[PDB]
């Protein structure tokens with residue numbers, strides 16, 4: 001009857017029911033197991049903790065992410081995650097709901113199949129569909145054509161889309177995303193004299209990032225400004241109550257996205273890869289890509305990032321070109337919302353892969369029914 | 372496939388203008404005498420069909436977005452535009468038209484001129500930490516029960532049990548050897564080691580019953596791991612195996628040997644492990660995916676019988 005939407009990202013599961021304006025469950029996509037070196041009889045009979053539970057116990061567990069750079073890598077823990085989502089979070093019987101899943105743009109062929117295998121064999125869903133994340137985000141913005149910048153916790157993509165479909169040859173990919181940016185902010189703050197290595201120190205750096213960081217409109221000006229005065233410094237209160245000041249680290253951390261050299265990546269910046277992606281496209285769609293740049297995912301939340309993109313893309317594009325960046329406020333959840341809508345459409349009942357179709361045709365069915 | 376729906380079937384039959392309004396996730400026709408009056412709280416899909424000299428039809432699809440229209444509606448317009456275009460075999464050009472910015476062509480479709488009216492149909496949209504309840508299995512008692520082939524024992528869970536002696540764990544394996552009732556065997560976090568893994572490997576050549584074995588969070592090493600995977604050459608029963616989180620990771624030549632060894636296993640459906648290298652990680656995933664589909668091939672020729 002009702003359809004389920006699961007948006008499985010590198011750091012976070014977003015999961016819920018089709019028709020809802022928002023996911024019912026949002027939780028860490030992780031599976032914990034007991035740490036060597038350690039203790040616990042508290043686990044009882046369990047080999048592992050999943051989700052929120054494992055996040056609690058992060059102290060005594062070694063945590064592992066089944067999705068890496070937006071791709072499924074550990075499949076046995078991916079099942080766990082999926083199982084927890086259905087039974088423990090949505091509290092549903094998966095064999096009773098059509099289920100929509102999401103994937104990264106360049107997801108390898110065999111993973112798309114495997115995800116199809118497991119949903120039918122292990123969870124016995126009556127029907128399923130796999131959609132590309134960025135594409136759903138474009139739809140959530142009310143567009144068929146656009147080029148999405150999608151940057152989460154694990155991976156950042158540039159995804160051009162025309163009249164409803166991604167153009168894969170032109171997709172660009174960057175491993176740098178939020179988790180790396182957190183680690184990067186730990187460093188330079190540390191090189192400033194604050195020392196965050198602790199399992200629960202990272203926790204605080206993450207908070208500073210999501211709170212005080214921003215993207216500079218022009219990097220060498222912002223660095224020259226920061227050098228000649230304190231106007232860009234901001235005070236931050238730690239849990240010990242100490243109030244400390246943090247400097248240019250505020251924008252040197254996200255600058256990594258436009259300057260991947262900072263962390264040691266030989267990769268070009270999201271501005272240059274945006275231009276490239278567009279440039280790899282048919283001249284005739286370019287004007288529509290330039291004019292629709294849609295940002296998706298939580299690592300696009302930094303204040304200032306839209307304006308920085310407008311500027312860099314203007315400096316790249318021709319003189320004439322109309323350039324616009326769309327930054328929807330709800331864009332941590334765009335991908336999920338876009339699926340919520342799509343699976344709720346009257347026209348959707350015919351797009352599902354049925355169990356029967358799967359039983360007869362096997363998993364390669366998903367290459368021909370899901371673009 | 373491609374979607375059908377009653378308005379899809381009426382779409383683009385012949386030169387003219389059709390206008391639909393997105394209403395609670397469905398596409399609904401606008402009464403033809405209401406054309407050009409657009410609720411600014413709604414979203415619309417417009418189709419302009421033109422005749423071509425050949426006798427086929429030129430399409431233009433516009434989706435119209437009201438400034439106050441809710442996210443589902445406008446998202447739904449864009450998608451309906453895409454499905455409609457697909458259904459027409461990609462031959463329609465897609466136009467996004469926002470209120471106040473609309474194309475001159477779009478505006479040229481209404482001789483009488485385009486009106487905005489406020490309003491529209493409503494949106495279709497609608498913690499603890501470390502210790503609980505230690506594992507109460509009696510090791511002795513259970514080990515015993517395996518020797519006697521107790522049919523009441525279908526499951527054996529030693530997980531998290533501290534301080535079990537290695538030769539007892541070894542003894543469990545020796546005991547599980549001819550057992551026909553134990554389908555599952557979970558020793559996670561027992562401090563088990565390669566000797567235990569060797570025993571288990573021997574066991575798995577003879578044992579025809581256990582489908583699931585869990586070694587997680589142990590001290591097993593690559594030669595323990597591998598010894599089990601050679602054993603599985605003689606074993607068509609075991610569908611699931613989990614070694615996550617050993618104290619020391621095996622390295623690449625171990626991951627490689629695993630993916631190699633499993634090429635001739637037709638049987639195992641699930642492997643818990645975290646591969647560091649993507650090459651074996653992928654190879655193994657393709658193999659498990661092949662073995663799983665054979666279970667669908669049977670199941671089909673099974674299903675292909677009853678007439």
Ligand SMILES: Nc1ncnc2c1ncn2[C@@H]1O[C@H](COP(=O)(O)OP(=O)(O)OP(=O)(O)O)[C@@H](O)[C@H]1O
Pocket residue numbers: 008009010011012013069070151152153154155156177178179206209210211296297298299300301302332
């Ligand atoms: N306000 C913020 N500023 C910067 N980063 C943020 C903010 N809020 C969340 N993030 C980051 O967004 C990420 C979560 O976003 P999202 O759920 O879109 O990623 P994901 O889907 O798990 O990742 P991926 O898309 O890479 O697989 C986390 O890295 C988090 O640190």
Ligand SMILES: [Ca+2]
Pocket residue numbers: 008009010133152297335
């Ligand atoms: Ca994501």
Ligand SMILES: [Ca+2]
Pocket residue numbers: 412413414439440441444490491492493494
């Ligand atoms: Ca409305």
Ligand SMILES: [Ca+2]
Pocket residue numbers: 163456461462463464465
């Ligand atoms: Ca077309």
